[PDB]
Amino acid sequence: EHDERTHVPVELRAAGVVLLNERGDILLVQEKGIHPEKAGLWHIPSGAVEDGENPQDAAVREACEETGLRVRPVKFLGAYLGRFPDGVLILRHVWLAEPEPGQTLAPAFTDEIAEASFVSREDFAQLYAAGQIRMYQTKLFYADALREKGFPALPV
């Protein structure tokens, strides 16, 4: 690793979680619309990481802001890079998380969030095939989470 390399500045960071319940259902957040006839796409509870702050703590805070649920990160799953049209790079971080016990889902309805909810493994497979999951990485990490927790893999 003593090989010379240059720094590739990353301007933005986002942090989110793949939160599963006892049945292996995954918690997703839905965007508010897209034509006016279609429903918004789904994504994992996530949000922006403040410059200089810990991404893991941000994942916990942002998840609560969107779903109203207090979560505990259990293990890092992965990070991936995206580039906006203008060249800005964003590094997204994803953790496997567990919800604290005794909580009721209470999504924060905003101009960006329609709602949030738990979706079963079978229904997620349908949503994915129907092109309703905003970022395909969600399926990659959900699969990792199911394996980590000892749940059956996604249908077919």
CA distance 25 to 120: 4
Residue 151 DSSP SS3: coil
Whole-angstrom distance, CA of residue 48 vs CA of residue 92: 9
Is residue 68 a contact residue for Sm ion (CB under 5 A)?
no
CA angle at 118 for the pair 139 and 111, rounded to the nearest 5°: 90
Binding span for its own copies by CB under 8 A among 8-16, 19-27, 100-108, 119-127: 8-16
Piece in contact with its own copies (CB under 8 A), picked from 4-12, 18-26, 97-105, 117-125: 4-12
Binders in 63-122 for its own copies, by CB under 8 A: 73, 75-85, 89-91, 93, 95, 112
* Residue 112 tokens, joined: 């960006």
**With helix as H, strand as E and coil as C, how does 18-48 read?**
EEECCCCCEEEEEECCCCCCCCCCEECCEEE
Q: Which residue from 87, 102, 150, 152 is in contact with Sm ion, where contact means CB under 5 A?
A: 87
Identity of the residue numbered 119: V
Please choose which of Sm ion, its own copies, none residue 84 contacts, taking the beta carbon within 5 to 8 angstroms, the exact cut-off set by kind.
Answer: its own copies
Question: What binding mask, one character per residue, do residues 121-140 give for its own copies by CB under 8 A, x or -?
Answer: -------------x------
Q: 87 contacts which partner out of its own copies, Sm ion, none, CB within 5 to 8 A by kind?
A: Sm ion
Dihedral angle sign, alpha carbons of residues 129, 16, 28, 114: negative
Cβ atoms within 10 Å, residue 29: 25
Question: Binding site for ATP: what residues are annotated?
Answer: 1-5, 47-48, 84-86
Binding site for its own copies (CB under 8 A): 1-10, 14, 31, 40-41, 43, 46, 54-56, 73, 75-85, 89-91, 93, 95, 112, 134, 144
Question: Binding site for Mg(2+): what residues are annotated?
Answer: 13, 46, 50, 62, 92
